[PDB]
Each structure stands twice: as C-alpha cells, then as structure tokens.
Design a protein around this ligand. Structure first.
Ligand code: ATP
Ligand code: MG
Ligand code: MG
Lengths: 147, 985
C-alpha cells in the first residue's frame, strides 16, 4: 500500500512524464491531483485537464478511483467526469502504474469509443455529424480547458 | 403464512416450502442436559411445529456445568419440568411440553426422535420401533472432549436438495440445431455431466420454453451439448438456462445392524484411524455403565480405566473387529468419561439441530451415519491433571473440572477478555464464557462493546434477547442475561455502546488494551475486523476471529509472535457493475435493482438535502455555484421542491407520481431509442442491440395493471412523507384522479453572453428568500429495508419491475428485491452454535499458552453437506534485516521522541540503512526526493511537532504512541523492508 505508492511517486519524480504530472494533495498519500495535456492531433489540442485520483485501502489489489474535474465533451465521460475504462473495473492488476492509467486516459481522449458509450447523445452526434462533434469539442476545450 | 418479519434471515437459507413443511413436524427429545437443551433451543428457534421433552431424572449440581436454563435453586427437581418453562419463551409459535412416561406406541405421534443420555439397550429398543415405522432417529452423545452422532431416517429417505447451492443459471449466447449451447463471452456454466437443465425466454425455439429436463454433455468450460433439437426449431437466439435438480434416494441402516458394520464420517483427514477406536470405546462406556448401576468411570482413575479397557477388549472380540486397540486413546476416553463441557455441547447441539432440520424438511445431505469427533488437542499440558486435582468439589464446574482440573479452573477464572460485537456469535460466546466460569475470580473481567439496537429479525438466532427487548441496546441486554445465567458474573462485566474504530481510541486506549488477555471478534464487516487485527498486532494480544454465511462457517486464531495476522489473508472483493451498464444497458435484474435504488436516492433523498441545506446555510447558493458539479441541477431541484411543484394535498402527489412515471419509463426510453435506433449498426457493421444489449420498449400507463398501480402508490406515499402529508391506499381515489390527466406532449430532441448566467439568475430571483421560510424543513427518506410500512422496498420493487418490463427482463418478487437491495446476509442459529463451540475450544488452548504451531487449529465447516475440516495456522513470515532474523508482523522499533535528523542518523548508523521515506498513517512526513529547503525546514523538528504541523491537527491528550511506516534502502541501493517504528511520546 504505502510502500507501493511511494515507489510509484519516486518513479514519477525520477522520470518526468512531460505530458503528465501527478502528485499528492497537500501531504496526503491517498489523494492525487493528476494533470493531462490534450493530444496534438485531437480536438482537445492545447488543453489541460485536472483529474482526482483516490487510492483504495487495499491498493494495489483494488483499482484506484479516477474522476475528471475539468469539463470535457467526450462520449465516454459524463457531466460528473466519470470515465468508462476497462483498466479501472476488471482489467486492473497489481502491476499497472498510475503512469499507465494516465497514458490510457490520454489514448481514450485521442480516439473515443462510440460503440459502447456512456453519454448517448454525444456518441450519436459523433457517429452522425462528425464536423459538429469536432466543433463542439473545440468549443468546450477552449471554454474550459484553457485558463 | 410464514412470519417473514422474524424468519427473514432463515428463509434465505431454507426457503418457503422447506419451512412450511418444517412447521408441520413434531420433535421428541430424550435427555435434557446441556446437549439436550442446546438441541431443544436450536429446534425451537428453527420453527418446528412443537417440541416435547422427556427427562425424569432429578437435577444435580454438576448438571449446571452445561445446562444454562438450570439454577442452583432447582436442585432436586426433574430437569424437564424446570426446563420447559424457560424453553417455551424462545419462540411463541413453538409450544413446548413434557411427558411423564414414554411408551413405545407414543413414539408414533412425532416426526423426529432425538436421544441423548440413554443406555444402549434403551436406544436399541427405541430404534427397533422408530425404524420400521419410518420415523427419523438421531442419537447424540458427549463424553468429555469426545462426541458421537448417529442418524437413521429410514430406508426410503427422499432428499430434494443435496448440496445447498442454488440451481445454476446462465444466459445463452445462441444454440445451434445440434444442441450445442454456449454461454456469453468469458462465462463458465459450471455444469457437470449427467445434469438436467431447462430453457426459458429462448427466441426461435418456443418449444424449449416448456421446461422439460434434458441431458447435459459438457463439451468444454464454456460450451456444452444437450442433444438433438431438430423438431422444435433450427436455431435459438438468446435465452436463459436453469439447472434442474433431481431427488436422491438414501437408504439408512438401523442401529442394531450398523453396530457390526458402521459407516463413518470423518471430521478430519489427518487422523482417520480413530473412529474405529471410538466406536468400540463408546459401546464399552455403555457396558461399563450397565455394569455399575449407570455410573460412568471416575475421572482420572486407573482401576476404572483398566476395567474399561477389559470391556473394550471383550466388545472387540465379540463383534469380530480386526482392529488393534489403542491403549492410550481408549484410556483417555475412560478418564474423561464423566466430563461435561459447554463448547462440545454447543458444537454437537448445532450439528444435531441441523440434522433434525434435514430430517423434517427433506433437504441437504445428512450424515450417513456415524460421526465421531474429538478435540483432544485442547487438553492442557502446563498444569497438573491427575486424580487428585480432577476430583469433584461440589460446585457447578464439576463437569469441567473432571476434564481440566482445579488449577486450570483458576487459570480460566482470572481471564480479562474483550468481546467486540454482540450479535449471534457474541451471545453464544458470552453464554459459553458464563458456563465455563471465565472471569469469575478476583482479577477477572469481561468487556463487551456494540452500538446497534435489537430488532425483531435478530430474535431468530440471538437467544439472549426477547420481544420485550426490541429497541434496546444489545450489550446491556446480553450482559444482564448472562449475569442471570451465572450470578458470579455480577459486576465482572462491562458493556459499552461504542463503535470500535479510529474515533474510539480515547476509550480503548493503551491502558485499556494493556490489561487484556485475549480479544474475540463477533463482527460482520471486514473494515472493523482489519482495525481490530491491527490493534491486536500493535499490542500483541491473542485474537479469535469467526464468521458465518448461511450454513458455512470458519474460525481462525491469531497468536502473537507465532502465526500470521488476519490482514495477511485477502478475500474476494464485492462486485460493482459498470456505470454504463446501469445507466443505459442493463441485462439482469440486479442492474435494474441498482438503478431503482439510485432513482430512490436521487428522488427522495438528495433534493431534500439540498433544499434543507439552502434553508439552513446562509451562504449555500454562492458556494454551490462555484463548488457543485451541476449548480443548475441544484437550483432546479430547489425551485421544483419549493415553488414549482410543491404539493398541497395528496392529489398533487399522485399527479407528480404519474409525471415521474412518464419521465422515467416512457420518455427516457424514447430518447435512448432516438439516439440509437433499433436498426442501428456499429462502426464495424454489426448490429448494435445485440448480445449484452437489449432493445427497450416504452411503457404506456395502464392503470388496471398491478405494477403501474404499485409504483404510483409507492411514489405518491413517499412524496407525501417528504412533504408530511396524509397518504391513502384506496384504489378509488387513484382511479378518479388519474382519469383526468393530460400527458404533456413530448418528442425526442436532437439538440443542434451571460444568457446561461442570466438563466441561473432568473432561477435564483424566483426562489423565495431563506428568511421567508424559517422552521420549514423537509424530511429526507433514509433507506430502511427492515420496516415493511415505509414504502421503501415496495417502491424499489415497483421501479425494478417496470424497468425490467422496459428491457424485457424477468421481474423479481419482493423477496428477491429485499434480498438484493439490502445486502442481507443469510444466517442460521446452528451455524452460530457451531462457530461458538469451535472458538471456545480454541480458547482453552489460548489460556494454556501452547507454544507449538501444530497444537492450534483453524476450522472450517459446511453443514449443508456435513463437512468439517481443520488446518494448522500459517506461520508468520520471517525476514533478514542487517543479518538478523526479524518477524514481518510481530516486530517493531521502539524509539524516543527525537528529532527527524536524529532518527535518520540512528537508522543510518544502528541499522546501516538509509531512510528514503517516512510516513505516519496517510501523511508523508519525509521523502528523499523533496526539495532541500523544505527538508532543511523540517529536519530540526521533533516527530510529534512535525506530525502536528503536517496533519494540521493537535495531538490528543490521551495519545501515548506514534506508529511510523518507514521505507529505507540498504547500502547497495536495494530496497529492504523493515518493521514499523513505535515512537514513544
Ligand atoms: N465496528 C464495529 N464496532 C462494534 N460493533 C460492531 C461494529 N461493526 C458491527 N458491529 C456489531 O456487530 C454485530 C453484528 O452482528 P449481526 O451481523 O449478526 O447483526 P446485525 O448486523 O444487526 O443483523 P442483520 O445482519 O441480520 O441485519 C452487530 O451488533 C453490529 O452492531
Ligand atoms: Mg442490526
Ligand atoms: Mg449484519
């Protein structure tokens, strides 16, 4: 638990993720404020998204809880910031680092999965009118993900 | 006709049909000593039609060694007459009677006959009649640390359920014309060859929906074969298969026939040559009793042991048993012949009561036929056991002194235990401690803590409580009851009402925990178990954990410096469903139940809390505007629940219920179908609503339907309760009001400055000012499953059934909805008795202070199949630190209150390790990757001051230690694990 979290934090400190920067809130080791940078070749380009990570007591035998804070217009992310991700529900194993989860979330941002959505209206707009989806995503990432 | 308000937990184990058949059976019990009274108690709590007692023997003092319904004022009175009055109070639906004399023909009036404390000739005479008349015959015996059970249910016993598991059900992907059936993706059916299954809700093959059983041929872990289905169809799409169980015929043998050729049940596989010894030994005991006017061999007597061994030799020769007798074990059985323990009595009473339930209900697999058990490893070895110390002293502990001696009695009487929880296991544990005389000396003490209150459903397996005690604290009632059982425990018991957790460290502090001798858990949640385990590890106290689940049970013992702790073992986690499955695409009734619970909370709980907080907090709106994720949602909820939709009578509540019905069961489905039409395809061309996704269908409100009416009633009642109005149940008002309702037009919508802020401001300026409504508060609906008149489970069932009708899922009744929504854990009284017996058998090992790890036993059992197993505890892992042996769990570092720099220097010098991380709980005190300035500011501070500064919280006056977790690297740079640090403030 604590030793694994400290190992992950030290690994993050030694190697700067560049695209990510995770760290404990205040001095609490079970609450992290992660930062994600929008992919260049994506509608969310030039945007900074802040995530809240809460580690469970039985970590790493249980997956952490990751919730978005910055508003994002994505098929798999609802208004509360919940994420529909496989490595957070059943594919989680006591071998994946938080850097891996952040990379997975970045990839999910790069290309959504409308086939099994969480917000049906956004997925429907994505599948039917792609240009409108691009415009909405750019507008949202300019209103919320900047400043 | 079953009172589900009392048998709520037992029905989830047995069922409605089993208990209905059980409530028509009569049980006779011969012998009313500790074992007999335990069996009678368990049967009465179970719910049989009646119980009859027969024991004309006058009471003696030593009979109080295990009989908890006898008092020292009853000496000289027949046990049945003084036990019937106290037994009749356990259950109001189970009359208890007493018969003066027992004639053979009278036995025809009963369904089961239990025999204890009876000689072999009388047992044979009774069995010769109860066999050929098809009456179940169970005979139990308990001699010291040895026990025997014998079952005989006739030659044509029909068993319906043989393992206690629910029938295997699964969802089918598709079925070909060759009978090959495959589950969904990555789903294992778990069937075996020769089983029978039935299919339901199969599309394309309606004929298979009849339910006729078919053979099962397992072709793999995910597929199987059923045969040929050519006639009924060509291909079946989707559907659900359910296993069908067939009754089994079991033929028992009579006692007279099974004496010569017995059939054994082995409670432990490490010693399987003993039961043949016990079979001879018990018969020799009966013969010796018949040869000395019914007087068993005296405790620890050599002459009686020799005579008993001669009888054993004679019996073995007569019965043509080709077994070499074990002199040591047989003479041990002779020594403890007159013993009478309460742990053995509880264990065997639970087992025999379960056997009685099996006989009456024709369920579960019974013992076939002999069950010989021994716990001889519990015999003390650090005290003197001989004829001088084991002689009776004319006290109520003679039945225990004859096994353990007076010195071990003194050891028991000076215990200072700590029992956590007062549930069923807590009540049984307190009974066992009262009977054993635990903490009855000058230096003894008992402490029991529990923060819950007695409810009606708890009276089915917690026998220390009464219907008049409903609503009172558990610990006080249990302490009073056990003080009544044993008057010597008057003032030696302290009952708290505190929850054991981080916030109770002010009461259960170092002073409290340094005087204990052992801790016993009777909890029901893993969090409290882990916390108590950590506290015991820190203070080095023996711990006794025990858990039950339906008919399964387990007991574990934790010994300081010897075995691993409770937290070292991990259990499978609870299953949580994906949000996307619950929100839009359910495929099981559990998903709909979870959605209905979330709907209940979001309708009747959260808006009420928001309104109340707005009317209480002076500056709620401004904080919610910039803090809440959806301030618009909060403002709309406040507006709707204050002005827009504030009811004035019950008719408006009915109107709102109808509106919510339309909003949640007709409009959301229409929107979802608009977003994803039924003919839509994925990006790969596959159909969308295929496999784990089912196409929903909007519901049109038909008042005459039962489910719609139930939902309307429940929603209207809950809304009226929220607004404190008067609800009604007559259908006339609902039919009248809902007749004149015009549904507002609805069509799916495709979407396509400070106006948003101005919209929020328009909502805000419409809200009445907080000062205008002072003292006006709305009552939130706190979920309560156990109350049947609060409309909670009714609403959940109605909503779940309506959503199941939306997605063509099979609805579930109120029983299953209550079981699922409330997370009710099935429980039984027999399992509680067995686990208490095992824990109390381990307690005498703990008292004696046995050192070897082979002398302790962790126990597991399953009463649905008669399975018992015992395995040695796992030794604590060891490690090498600086070339020394260190225990991973039971070791610590003790250091003074020094500065951080001094601590680092000490670890660098004394242990030769470099400290790279130091934390205290969940706060990071020091790390090797922090900036130099912060470290230089933190290094010269003392540990306590550093902790106070970092945690922003002053240390409490009662705090006397700090537990620090340290990660340190070796000289080479390799990480090495070290035990925690115990800073002494
Ligand atoms: N952290 C805790 N500290 C102290 N007592 C606890 C703690 N957690 C649970 N308990 C007590 O443990 C007992 C658990 O017993 P049990 O589960 O049989 O009863 P119940 O939960 O009230 O009943 P049911 O599960 O049948 O509704 C309860 O008295 C509960 O109050
Ligand atoms: Mg309770
Ligand atoms: Mg419970």
């Amino acid at each position: 638990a604590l030793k694994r979290i400290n190992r992950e934090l030290a690994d993050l400190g030694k190697d700067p993720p560049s695209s990510s920067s995770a760290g404990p809130v205040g001095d609490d080791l079970f609450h992290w404020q992660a930062t994600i940078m929008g992919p260049a070749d994506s509608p969310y380009a030039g945007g900074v998204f802040f995530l809240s990570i809460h580690f469970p007591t039985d970590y790493p035998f249980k997956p952490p809880k990751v919730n978005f804070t910055t508003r994002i217009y994505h098929p798999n992310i609802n208004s509360n910031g919940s994420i529909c991700l496989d490595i957070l529900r059943d594919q989680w194993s006591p071998a994946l680092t938080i850097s891996k989860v952040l990379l997975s979330i970045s990839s999910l941002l790069t290309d959504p999965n409308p086939d099994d959505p969480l917000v049906p209206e956004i997925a429907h707009v994505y599948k039917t009118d792609r240009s409108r989806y691009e415009l909405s995503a750019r507008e949202w990432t300019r209103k919320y993900a900047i400043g | 006709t079953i009172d589900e308000g009392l048998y709520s937990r037992q029905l989830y184990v047995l069922g409605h049909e089993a208990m209905k058949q059980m409530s028509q059976s009569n049980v006779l019990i011969i012998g009313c000593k500790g074992l007999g009274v335990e069996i009678a108690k368990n049967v009465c709590l179970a719910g049989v039609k009646s119980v009859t007692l027969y024991d004309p023997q006058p009471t003696r003092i030593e009979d109080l060694s295990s009989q908890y319904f006898l008092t020292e004022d009853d000496i000289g009175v027949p046990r049945a007459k003084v036990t019937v009055s106290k037994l009749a109070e356990l259950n109001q639906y189970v009359p208890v009677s007493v018969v003066d004399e027992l004639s053979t023909e009278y036995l025809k009036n009963f369904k089961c006959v239990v025999v204890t404390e009876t000689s072999l000739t009388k047992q044979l005479e009774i069995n010769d009649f109860t066999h050929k008349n098809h009456i179940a015959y169970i005979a139990a015996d308990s001699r010291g640390l040895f026990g025997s059970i014998f079952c005989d249910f006739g030659e044509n016993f029909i068993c319906t359920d043989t393992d206690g598991n629910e029938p295997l059900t699964g969802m089918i992907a598709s079925i070909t014309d060759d009978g090959v059936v495959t589950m969904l993706e990555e789903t294992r059916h778990g069937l075996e060859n020769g089983d029978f299954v039935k299919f339901t809700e199969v599309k394309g093959m309606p004929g298979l929906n009849d339910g006729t059983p078919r053979k099962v041929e397992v072709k793999g872990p995910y597929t199987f074969s059923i045969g040929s289905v050519k006639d009924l169809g060509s291909a079946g799409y989707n559907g659900v298969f359910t296993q069908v169980k067939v009754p089994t015929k079991i033929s028992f043998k009579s006692l007279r026939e099974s004496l010569k050729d017995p059939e054994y049940v082995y409670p432990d596989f490490g010693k399987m040559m003993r039961p043949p010894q016990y079979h001879i030994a018990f018969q020799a005991l009966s013969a010796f009793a018949d040869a000395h006017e019914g007087s068993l061999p005296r405790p620890r007597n050599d002459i009686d042991a020799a005579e008993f061994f001669e009888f054993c030799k004679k019996i073995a020769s007569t019965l043509q048993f080709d077994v070499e007798l074990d002199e040591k074990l047989i003479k041990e059985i002779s020594y403890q012949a007159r013993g009478d323990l309460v742990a053995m009595s509880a264990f065997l009473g639970g087992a025999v009561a379960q056997e009685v339930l099996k006989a009456t209900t024709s369920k579960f697999y019974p013992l076939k036929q002999y069950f010989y058990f021994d716990s001889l490893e519990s015999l003390p070895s650090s005290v003197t056991i001989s004829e001088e110390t084991c002689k009776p002293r004319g006290c109520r502990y003679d039945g225990q002194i004859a096994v353990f001696g007076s010195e071990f009695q003194e050891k028991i009487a000076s215990l200072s235990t700590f029992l956590v929880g007062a549930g069923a296991i807590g009540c049984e544990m307190l009974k066992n401690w009262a009977m054993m005389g635990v903490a009855t000396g000058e230096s003894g003490h008992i402490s029991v803590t529990d923060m819950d209150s007695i409810e009606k459903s708890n009276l089915n397996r917690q026998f220390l409580f009464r219907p008049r005690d409903v609503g009172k604290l558990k610990s006080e009632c249990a302490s009073t009851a056990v003080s009544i059982m044993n008057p010597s425990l008057t003032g030696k018991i302290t009952s708290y009402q505190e929850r054991v957790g981080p916030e109770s460290e002010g009461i259960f502090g170092d002073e409290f925990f340094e005087k204990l001798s052992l801790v016993t858990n009777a909890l029901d949640n893993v969090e409290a178990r882990m916390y108590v385990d950590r506290r015991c590890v820190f203070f080095e106290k023996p711990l006794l954990e025990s858990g039950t689940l339906g008919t399964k049970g387990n007991t574990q013992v934790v010994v300081p410096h010897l075995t691993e702790s409770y937290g070292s073992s991990q259990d499978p986690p609870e299953k949580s469903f994906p949000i996307c499955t619950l929100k839009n695409f359910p495929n099981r009734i559990e998903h709909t139940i979870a959605w209905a619970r979330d709907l209940f909370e979001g309708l009747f709980k959260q808006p009420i809390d928001n309104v109340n907080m707005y009317l209480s907090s002076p500056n709620f709106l401004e904080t919610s505007l910039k803090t809440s994720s959806n301030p618009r949602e909060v403002l709309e909820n406040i507006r709707d629940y204050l002005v827009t939709e504030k009811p004035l009578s019950f008719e408006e509540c009915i109107m709102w219920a109808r509106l919510q019905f339309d909003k949640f069961f007709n409009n959301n489905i229409q929107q979802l179908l608009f977003n994803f039409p039924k003919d839509s395809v994925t990006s790969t061309g596959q159909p969308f609503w295929s496999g784990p996704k089912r196409a929903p269908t909007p519901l049109s409100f038909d008042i005459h339907n039962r489910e719609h009416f139930d939902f309307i009633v429940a929603a209207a009642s809950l809304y009226a309760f929220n607004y404190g109005l008067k609800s009604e149940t007559d259908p006339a008002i609902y039919e009248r009001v809902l007749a004149g309702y015009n549904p507002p037009p609805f069509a799916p919508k495709s979407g396509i400055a400070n106006k948003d802020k101005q919209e929020l401001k328009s909502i805000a300026d419409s809200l009445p000012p907080p000062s205008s409504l002072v003292g006006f508060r709305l009552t939130p609906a706190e979920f309560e499953k156990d109350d049947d008149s609060n409309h909670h489970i009714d609403f959940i069932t109605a909503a779940s059934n309506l959503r199941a009708m939306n997605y063509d899922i099979t609805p579930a009744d109120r029983f299953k909805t209550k079981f699922v929504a409330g997370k009710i854990v099935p429980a039984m009284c027999t399992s509680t008795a067995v686990v208490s017996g095992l824990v109390c058998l381990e307690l005498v090992k703990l008292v004696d202070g046995k050192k070897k790890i082979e002398e302790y036993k962790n126990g597991f059992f399953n009463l649905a199949i008669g399975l018992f197993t015992f395995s040695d505890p796992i030794a604590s892992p060891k490690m090498k630190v600086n070339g020394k042996e260190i225990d991973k769990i039971w070791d610590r570092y003790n250091l003074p209150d020094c500065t951080l720099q001094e601590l680092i220097d000490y670890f660098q010098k004394e242990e030769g390790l470099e400290v790279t991380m130091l934390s205290s709980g969940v706060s990071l005190l020091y790390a090797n990757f922090q900036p130099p300035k912060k470290l230089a500011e933190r290094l010269p501070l003392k540990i306590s001051e550093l902790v106070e500064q970092i945690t922003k919280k002053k240390l409490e006056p009662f705090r006397k230690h700090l537990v620090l977790e340290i990660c340190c690297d070796d000289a080479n740079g390799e990480d090495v694990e070290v035990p925690f640090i115990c800073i002494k403030l």
